[PDB]
Amino acid sequence: TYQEFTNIDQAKAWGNAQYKKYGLSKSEKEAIVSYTKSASEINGKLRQNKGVINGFPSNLIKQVELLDKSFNKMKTPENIMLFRGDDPAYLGTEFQNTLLNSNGTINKTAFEKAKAKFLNKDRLEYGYISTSLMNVSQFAGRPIITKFKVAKGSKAGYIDPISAFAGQLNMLLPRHSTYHIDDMRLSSDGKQIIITATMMGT
Protein backbone atom coordinates (compact mmCIF):
# COMPACT_ATOMS: atom_id res chain seq x y z
CA THR A 1 0.00 0.00 0.00
CA TYR A 2 0.97 3.72 0.17
CA GLN A 3 2.64 5.41 3.14
CA GLU A 4 -0.01 7.88 4.39
CA PHE A 5 1.78 10.05 6.99
CA THR A 6 -0.21 10.74 10.17
CA ASN A 7 2.37 12.33 12.46
CA ILE A 8 3.71 15.79 11.69
CA ASP A 9 7.18 14.95 13.18
CA GLN A 10 7.94 11.72 11.28
CA ALA A 11 6.74 13.55 8.16
CA LYS A 12 9.10 16.55 8.59
CA ALA A 13 11.94 14.17 9.54
CA TRP A 14 11.31 12.03 6.43
CA GLY A 15 11.27 15.08 4.16
CA ASN A 16 14.51 16.23 5.77
CA ALA A 17 16.19 12.86 5.19
CA GLN A 18 15.18 13.15 1.50
CA TYR A 19 16.25 16.82 1.05
CA LYS A 20 19.83 16.30 2.23
CA LYS A 21 20.63 13.80 -0.52
CA TYR A 22 19.28 15.87 -3.42
CA GLY A 23 22.55 17.69 -4.06
CA LEU A 24 20.74 20.53 -5.86
CA SER A 25 22.56 23.41 -7.62
CA LYS A 26 22.05 27.00 -6.35
CA SER A 27 20.22 28.02 -9.58
CA GLU A 28 17.76 25.07 -9.20
CA LYS A 29 17.26 26.32 -5.61
CA GLU A 30 16.58 29.91 -6.74
CA ALA A 31 14.14 28.54 -9.31
CA ILE A 32 12.11 26.69 -6.65
CA VAL A 33 11.84 29.46 -4.05
CA SER A 34 10.57 31.47 -7.07
CA TYR A 35 8.02 28.74 -8.06
CA THR A 36 6.43 28.77 -4.58
CA LYS A 37 6.04 32.59 -4.66
CA SER A 38 4.09 32.73 -7.93
CA ALA A 39 2.87 29.10 -8.42
CA SER A 40 -0.60 29.87 -9.81
CA GLU A 41 0.60 32.38 -12.48
CA ILE A 42 3.10 29.81 -13.79
CA ASN A 43 0.57 27.01 -13.89
CA GLY A 44 -2.15 29.46 -14.84
CA LYS A 45 0.08 30.28 -17.82
CA LEU A 46 1.26 26.80 -18.71
CA ARG A 47 -2.38 25.68 -18.80
CA GLN A 48 -3.41 28.27 -21.43
CA ASN A 49 -0.33 27.22 -23.52
CA LYS A 50 -0.91 23.41 -23.25
CA GLY A 51 2.60 22.79 -21.94
CA VAL A 52 4.62 24.04 -24.95
CA ILE A 53 7.45 26.32 -23.82
CA ASN A 54 9.56 27.26 -26.89
CA GLY A 55 8.06 30.79 -26.99
CA PHE A 56 8.06 32.33 -23.46
CA PRO A 57 10.03 35.20 -21.70
CA SER A 58 13.70 34.27 -20.95
CA ASN A 59 13.17 34.44 -17.15
CA LEU A 60 10.57 31.62 -17.39
CA ILE A 61 12.24 29.30 -19.97
CA LYS A 62 15.36 29.25 -17.76
CA GLN A 63 13.09 28.77 -14.70
CA VAL A 64 10.81 25.97 -16.07
CA GLU A 65 13.80 24.10 -17.59
CA LEU A 66 15.52 24.14 -14.19
CA LEU A 67 12.38 23.01 -12.40
CA ASP A 68 12.16 20.03 -14.81
CA LYS A 69 15.90 19.34 -14.33
CA SER A 70 15.53 19.31 -10.48
CA PHE A 71 13.41 16.21 -10.78
CA ASN A 72 16.43 14.15 -11.94
CA LYS A 73 17.75 14.51 -8.35
CA MET A 74 14.31 14.28 -6.61
CA LYS A 75 12.67 10.85 -6.40
CA THR A 76 10.55 9.21 -3.65
CA PRO A 77 11.99 5.95 -2.28
CA GLU A 78 8.50 4.56 -1.57
CA ASN A 79 4.84 4.55 -2.50
CA ILE A 80 3.37 7.67 -0.91
CA MET A 81 0.13 9.54 -0.42
CA LEU A 82 0.17 13.28 -1.00
CA PHE A 83 -2.73 15.72 -0.42
CA ARG A 84 -4.12 18.84 -1.99
CA GLY A 85 -6.99 21.33 -1.52
CA ASP A 86 -8.74 22.82 -4.61
CA ASP A 87 -11.56 25.39 -5.23
CA PRO A 88 -14.63 24.76 -7.50
CA ALA A 89 -13.14 26.14 -10.72
CA TYR A 90 -10.92 23.05 -10.65
CA LEU A 91 -13.92 21.01 -11.92
CA GLY A 92 -14.85 23.42 -14.73
CA THR A 93 -16.43 26.83 -15.33
CA GLU A 94 -19.94 25.33 -14.86
CA PHE A 95 -19.05 24.28 -11.31
CA GLN A 96 -17.43 27.57 -10.26
CA ASN A 97 -20.61 29.13 -8.85
CA THR A 98 -22.83 26.01 -8.59
CA LEU A 99 -20.81 23.62 -6.45
CA LEU A 100 -21.60 25.08 -3.08
CA ASN A 101 -25.09 25.30 -1.52
CA SER A 102 -25.62 28.62 0.27
CA ASN A 103 -25.37 26.83 3.71
CA GLY A 104 -21.70 26.01 2.94
CA THR A 105 -22.23 22.37 1.89
CA ILE A 106 -22.07 20.68 -1.50
CA ASN A 107 -25.02 20.80 -3.87
CA LYS A 108 -26.29 17.28 -4.38
CA THR A 109 -27.10 17.81 -8.08
CA ALA A 110 -23.80 19.66 -8.80
CA PHE A 111 -21.86 16.79 -7.21
CA GLU A 112 -23.66 14.05 -9.22
CA LYS A 113 -22.88 15.82 -12.49
CA ALA A 114 -19.21 16.21 -11.39
CA LYS A 115 -19.11 12.53 -10.33
CA ALA A 116 -20.36 11.60 -13.81
CA LYS A 117 -17.94 13.94 -15.70
CA PHE A 118 -14.86 12.70 -13.89
CA LEU A 119 -15.38 9.31 -12.18
CA ASN A 120 -13.11 6.66 -13.77
CA LYS A 121 -11.48 9.14 -16.21
CA ASP A 122 -7.96 10.24 -16.78
CA ARG A 123 -7.03 13.85 -16.38
CA LEU A 124 -3.92 15.65 -17.70
CA GLU A 125 -2.35 18.62 -15.84
CA TYR A 126 -0.06 21.09 -17.61
CA GLY A 127 0.86 22.93 -14.46
CA TYR A 128 3.22 21.63 -11.88
CA ILE A 129 1.22 20.18 -8.94
CA SER A 130 1.84 21.44 -5.41
CA THR A 131 0.96 19.04 -2.59
CA SER A 132 1.57 18.30 1.07
CA LEU A 133 2.67 15.24 3.04
CA MET A 134 -0.48 15.47 5.19
CA ASN A 135 -3.78 17.33 4.99
CA VAL A 136 -2.23 20.51 6.37
CA SER A 137 -4.38 23.31 7.86
CA GLN A 138 -3.52 25.80 5.04
CA PHE A 139 -5.53 23.93 2.39
CA ALA A 140 -7.62 21.35 4.22
CA GLY A 141 -10.46 23.94 4.27
CA ARG A 142 -11.03 24.20 0.47
CA PRO A 143 -14.10 22.34 -0.83
CA ILE A 144 -12.12 19.70 -2.77
CA ILE A 145 -9.43 17.51 -1.16
CA THR A 146 -7.48 15.08 -3.31
CA LYS A 147 -5.38 12.18 -2.16
CA PHE A 148 -2.79 11.21 -4.74
CA LYS A 149 -1.22 7.75 -4.62
CA VAL A 150 2.32 8.08 -5.99
CA ALA A 151 4.50 5.03 -6.88
CA LYS A 152 8.00 4.36 -5.54
CA GLY A 153 10.65 5.89 -7.81
CA SER A 154 8.39 8.60 -9.28
CA LYS A 155 9.49 12.23 -9.57
CA ALA A 156 8.47 14.07 -6.40
CA GLY A 157 10.46 16.42 -4.19
CA TYR A 158 10.24 17.83 -0.66
CA ILE A 159 10.84 21.50 -1.33
CA ASP A 160 9.81 22.79 2.16
CA PRO A 161 13.37 23.90 3.06
CA ILE A 162 13.55 26.14 -0.12
CA SER A 163 10.03 27.51 -0.05
CA ALA A 164 8.70 31.03 0.77
CA PHE A 165 6.61 29.95 3.76
CA ALA A 166 8.07 26.84 5.44
CA GLY A 167 6.65 24.32 8.00
CA GLN A 168 3.76 23.39 5.64
CA LEU A 169 5.08 19.91 4.51
CA ASN A 170 5.44 21.10 0.84
CA MET A 171 6.00 18.55 -1.91
CA LEU A 172 6.20 19.17 -5.64
CA LEU A 173 5.26 16.92 -8.62
CA PRO A 174 6.36 17.62 -12.24
CA ARG A 175 4.38 19.44 -14.93
CA HIS A 176 2.40 17.49 -17.57
CA SER A 177 1.49 14.63 -15.15
CA THR A 178 -1.56 12.40 -15.73
CA TYR A 179 -3.77 10.72 -13.16
CA HIS A 180 -6.82 8.47 -13.02
CA ILE A 181 -9.78 9.31 -10.80
CA ASP A 182 -10.76 6.27 -8.71
CA ASP A 183 -13.28 7.63 -6.12
CA MET A 184 -15.35 10.81 -5.70
CA ARG A 185 -17.41 10.89 -2.47
CA LEU A 186 -18.94 13.40 -0.05
CA SER A 187 -17.21 13.86 3.33
CA SER A 188 -18.83 12.71 6.66
CA ASP A 189 -20.14 16.22 7.40
CA GLY A 190 -21.21 16.91 3.77
CA LYS A 191 -19.11 20.12 3.20
CA GLN A 192 -16.37 18.54 1.02
CA ILE A 193 -15.50 16.29 -1.91
CA ILE A 194 -12.78 13.79 -1.28
CA ILE A 195 -11.26 12.60 -4.55
CA THR A 196 -8.86 9.69 -4.75
CA ALA A 197 -6.46 9.44 -7.63
CA THR A 198 -3.53 7.37 -8.84
CA MET A 199 -0.53 9.17 -10.43
CA MET A 200 -0.06 7.63 -13.90
CA GLY A 201 3.34 9.37 -14.16
CA THR A 202 4.55 11.87 -16.84
Ligand SMILES: NC(=O)c1ccc[n+]([C@@H]2O[C@H](COP(=O)([O-])OP(=O)(O)OC[C@H]3O[C@@H](n4cnc5c(N)ncnc54)[C@H](O)[C@@H]3O)[C@@H](O)[C@H]2O)c1
Ligand atom coordinates in the same frame (compact mmCIF):
# COMPACT_ATOMS: atom_id res chain seq x y z
N1 LIG B 1 -3.36 23.59 -2.72
C1 LIG B 1 -2.48 22.79 -2.15
O1 LIG B 1 -2.86 21.52 -1.81
C2 LIG B 1 -1.06 23.16 -1.83
C3 LIG B 1 -0.22 22.20 -1.24
C4 LIG B 1 1.11 22.54 -0.94
C5 LIG B 1 1.58 23.82 -1.22
N2 LIG B 1 0.76 24.73 -1.81
C6 LIG B 1 1.28 26.10 -2.07
O2 LIG B 1 0.23 27.03 -2.42
C7 LIG B 1 0.60 27.75 -3.56
C8 LIG B 1 -0.09 27.14 -4.78
O3 LIG B 1 -1.43 26.85 -4.44
P1 LIG B 1 -2.39 26.20 -5.52
O4 LIG B 1 -1.98 24.80 -5.49
O5 LIG B 1 -3.74 26.63 -5.18
O6 LIG B 1 -2.05 26.75 -7.02
P2 LIG B 1 -2.59 26.12 -8.43
O7 LIG B 1 -1.72 26.72 -9.54
O8 LIG B 1 -2.50 24.63 -8.38
O9 LIG B 1 -4.14 26.49 -8.70
C9 LIG B 1 -4.65 27.80 -8.46
C10 LIG B 1 -6.16 27.80 -8.23
O10 LIG B 1 -6.73 27.35 -9.44
C11 LIG B 1 -7.53 26.20 -9.25
N3 LIG B 1 -7.33 25.28 -10.37
C12 LIG B 1 -6.51 24.19 -10.44
N4 LIG B 1 -6.66 23.62 -11.65
C13 LIG B 1 -7.54 24.34 -12.35
C14 LIG B 1 -8.04 24.19 -13.61
N5 LIG B 1 -7.62 23.19 -14.38
N6 LIG B 1 -8.96 25.10 -14.07
C15 LIG B 1 -9.41 26.13 -13.26
N7 LIG B 1 -8.90 26.28 -11.99
C16 LIG B 1 -7.97 25.39 -11.55
C17 LIG B 1 -7.12 25.61 -7.91
O11 LIG B 1 -8.19 25.00 -7.28
C18 LIG B 1 -6.64 26.82 -7.15
O12 LIG B 1 -7.72 27.30 -6.39
C19 LIG B 1 2.11 27.63 -3.55
O13 LIG B 1 2.58 28.53 -2.56
C20 LIG B 1 2.33 26.19 -3.14
O14 LIG B 1 3.60 25.94 -2.59
C21 LIG B 1 -0.55 24.42 -2.11
